[PDB]
């Protein structure tokens, strides 16, 4: 089963993503194929998949930027029926907004079927151009047709996943305790994590004994990433990944406060020094506490 | 011995505080007697007392706002010698800026003696008017003269003191762990804590599932109080008191993230709800973790 999470949804035949045109919140805004840049935030192309209770393999798909839902227009089973963004709710009973998502016959990509119409999300004619129509279309679960096949590229971690990446790190103190604050997290590219740091004003902050020292830098970075999240995205039900750690050096006589993020493959953490913007696989400290 | 800390220094004969005139950082800015308002930040009237290593009962006194030091002008032992703010450093060997501070013969107020001149800080003629001259003057350790007697009203807590106030609270979970970030903390009046909340923009923030929920409010408040500290005060070597707590309800099935401060008498904590500005002796949660 596809897991709850945020996905960048990429056609299997051509490198077009599912894009809500201009990120618009208007009802009936077209969902189209569009090119994308890897290792960036693709602002109009992220989708929060919310599993429906007791309805196997069935989800709402909420655009992260607009807060509006993937909607098959009037639920029509006619081939060519528009797929658009439309107002809704995460656990709606409106079948126009409910999608059964299961692996295709290649075992890697998925097909996306409207729960009411039983038709599939289709990149019409396999057209790779920016703005190409996506429609509901007749199809089967098992056929090869790449027009109806979609890679769900996972852009978030659950809290259990973040905890696993931390636990595999070698720079964790024996007395470590971690404090989990949310359930599902958008993982940022370093380019974006850095941009938030820059825009927070921290690059200009001066270290001052106790009154603006390492703990203040680290907490300010976390707060800046939390503000960024709320100010940037209209969907609810996820957070943005940015941790704080306290750590102690090998000699046991100096402690430090810093941030952390996740690798691109989501399997490991990487430390961030908010006093200078650097990313480090070894910051010189073993973490005794984290919150994220 | 007077403990390291921040003090509001009040004459024993008349209710005038030691005030660095207009908070000015200029060398030679007069230190004068001035009236004050209890339970406020008295912006020009706070002094960070730094003990000198191996020099019994002897300190520098740094104005918290200006960052400049109490200085006996050219170290003169003449009665009437100006006491002024002047550039220096926390552990200076300049005797013009070193002060031996010990209890007077009333056992409550202190006398303040210049380490070089052996003269005492004196509110000239006991004058209660705003802007009255403070000077160095001849005197004795044991005499009653109220012109040379000063109540050191303690406005900060050590970390050990904050930890004690938390440990006496009844709403602490069995699994509680606290994480100490600094060593000495300015305790804010609630009026000021509230003003920082208002000025942070939090009163206008909307609760949103995971993306701006209780943890985000609490961390933003802490960050706002940390920014306030650095932007408001020029002295170093202290922090501003504002904690974050995570807690769990009695039934064990709901958790919450909130802030905390200290009572006026510094002996107890009081919870703060950053979603609405309220102060509570019981927020409905027992804390399992804190950082401050
Ligand atoms: C059959 C029809 O279903 C619902 O209307 C849908 C639309 O539903 C969504 O938007 C409407 C406002 O237009 C409303 O906010 C609703 O809660 C939301 O789910 C939408 O799916 C469009 C495009 O496919 O189709 C129908 O208009 C319902 O509101 C109608 O009363 C009626 O039951
Ligand atoms: C080039 C082409 O690929 C396949 O046709 C697709 C369409 O395939 C879907 O619709 C057809 C009926 O129109 C049939 O139901 C098929 O099972 C289903 O997957 C559809 O993807 C459209 C729009 O993008 O493009 C092509 O027509 C294939 O069936 C055709 O034989 C042909 O090889
Ligand atoms: C005896 C004299 O002592 C020092 O000068 C002091 C002043 O010292 C303070 O300010 C000066 C700059 O004016 C400098 O920054 C110094 O480090 C600092 O401690 C001050 O106490 C004034 C007013 O009482 O008196 C003397 O000017 C030293 O700089 C001089 O060279 C000389 O040794
Ligand atoms: C009213 C007055 O109070 C006391 O005199 C103080 C001064 O006291 C200090 O200085 C005198 C010498 O001028 C002497 O050394 C005394 O021990 C020392 O405390 C001084 O505080 C000035 C400036 O504020 O005001 C008064 O003159 C007292 O000795 C006088 O007899 C008289 O009762
Ligand atoms: C917010 C906006 O994002 C970018 O433009 C989007 C655009 O983004 C995708 O396509 C561009 C090329 O047009 C790049 O491949 C990006 O990496 C993609 O994410 C599309 O989403 C369209 C259609 O909805 O809207 C544009 O606003 C960027 O080019 C803009 O500068 C801007 O940052
Ligand atoms: C920053 C400034 O603070 C206040 O004025 C100070 C003044 O403050 C004291 O005296 C006033 C009465 O003049 C009240 O009692 C305050 O509670 C005191 O803290 C003095 O410090 C003088 C001399 O250094 O400077 C003034 O700037 C306040 O009145 C101003 O509005 C302002 O907030
Ligand atoms: Ca949360
Ligand atoms: Ca600090
Ligand atoms: Ca610290
Ligand atoms: Ca959150
Ligand atoms: Cl094409
Ligand atoms: Cl096939
Ligand atoms: Cl949701
Ligand atoms: Cl008077
Ligand atoms: Cl006497
Ligand atoms: Cl200091
Ligand atoms: Na820096
Ligand atoms: Na509110």
UniProtKB/TrEMBL annotation, chains A, B:
Ligand binding (Mn(2+) 3): 182, 210, 213, 215-216
Residues that bind Zn(2+) 4: 171, 286
Keyword flag Calcium: yes
Binding positions for Mn(2+) 1 per the UniProt entry: 171, 286
Residues the record lists as binding Zn(2+) 3: 147
Binding site for Zn(2+) 1: 8, 10
Molecular function terms, GO-annotated: metal ion binding
CDD domains tied to this protein: beta-trefoil_Ricin-like, beta-trefoil_Ricin_MOA-like
Binding sites annotated in the UniProt record for Mn(2+) 2: 181-182, 213, 215
UniProt domain Ricin B lectin: residue ranges: 44-137
Binding sites annotated in the UniProt record for Ca(2+) 2: 182, 210, 213, 215-216
Keywords annotated in UniProt: Calcium, Metal-binding, Zinc
Binding annotation for Ca(2+) 1: 181-182, 213, 215
Classification via InterPro entries: Agglutinin_C, Papain-like_cys_pep_sf, Ricin_B-like_lectins, Ricin_B_lectin
Keyword Zinc: yes
SUPFAM superfamilies: Cysteine proteinases (SSF54001), Ricin B-like lectins (SSF50370)
Residues given in the record as Zn(2+) 5 binding sites: 214, 256
Domain Agglutinin C-terminal: 185-277
Residues that, per the record, bind Zn(2+) 6: 282
Residues reported in the UniProt entry to bind Zn(2+) 2: 96
Name this protein carries in UniProt: Agglutinin
Lineage: Eukaryota, Fungi, Dikarya, Basidiomycota, Agaricomycotina
